[PDB]
Design a protein around this ligand. Sequence first.
Ligand SMILES: COc1ccc(S(=O)(=O)N(C[C@H]2CCC(=O)N2)C[C@@H](O)[C@H](Cc2ccccc2)NC(=O)O[C@@H]2C[C@@H]3CCO[C@@H]3C2)cc1
Ligand SMILES: [Cl-]
Ligand SMILES: [Cl-]
Ligand SMILES: [Cl-]
Ligand SMILES: [Cl-]
Ligand code: NA
Ligand code: NA
Lengths: 99, 99
Amino acid sequence: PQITLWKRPLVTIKIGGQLKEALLDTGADDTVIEEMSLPGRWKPKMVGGIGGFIKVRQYDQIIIEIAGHKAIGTVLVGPTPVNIIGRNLLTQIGATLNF
Amino acid sequence: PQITLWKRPLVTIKIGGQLKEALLDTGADDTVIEEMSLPGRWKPKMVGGIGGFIKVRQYDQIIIEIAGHKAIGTVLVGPTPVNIIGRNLLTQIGATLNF
Ligand SMILES: COc1ccc(S(=O)(=O)N(C[C@H]2CCC(=O)N2)C[C@@H](O)[C@H](Cc2ccccc2)NC(=O)O[C@@H]2C[C@@H]3CCO[C@@H]3C2)cc1
Ligand SMILES: [Cl-]
Ligand SMILES: [Cl-]
Ligand SMILES: [Cl-]
Ligand SMILES: [Cl-]
Ligand code: NA
Ligand code: NA
């Protein structure tokens, strides 16, 4: 699809067996999802933005369906105010910014 | 252009006669720029990013060039770690997300 930017570019994702809404975010290096359980090992990380940093759990090799496109990668889990699909997974679905 | 996302989507902007680097950020509603001087009056605004809320100065109707495309619109000035071009100006340059 072609998604215009008049509105937030929200899509449905499936992660850990759960359907969620998430933002397609070219300004995010990494994918950051609100607190939920995921299987396997994790390690702590800090991620920073406007307003400062939050502590997250970094889970590697997590499969996420994004607008019906499968992608695998690292997912960060923590107290983000919105679910964010960052560049690490946008690349895998072939997303580009065009103007 | 068509911009892939394997690297950060950094572009040159021109504002107040000065070249700066900024991030094209589809997850940002608003354009937020590091401390600089801008003409005219400003209004208050609170911006809620990943780590919390910050105060910014809102300047309306500011001339800004983005990757060689001319925009005139709202710029927020405050302590962001990176200059970010949000959807209010991405729409002015005709940007879309495609996959
Ligand atoms: C390492 O991986 C990441 C690091 C930081 C973030 S981030 O969420 O902080 N952010 C990074 C950007 C903004 C600062 C910067 O230098 N780069 C991703 C953004 O798209 C973020 C994504 C976002 C975070 C929190 C709330 C909503 C969106 N949007 C955002 O901060 O927008 C600001 C806040 C205001 C709300 C939305 O628009 C307004 C302008 C995401 C992943
Ligand atoms: Cl970070
Ligand atoms: Cl990854
Ligand atoms: Cl590619
Ligand atoms: Cl505007
Ligand atoms: Na894992
Ligand atoms: Na003004």
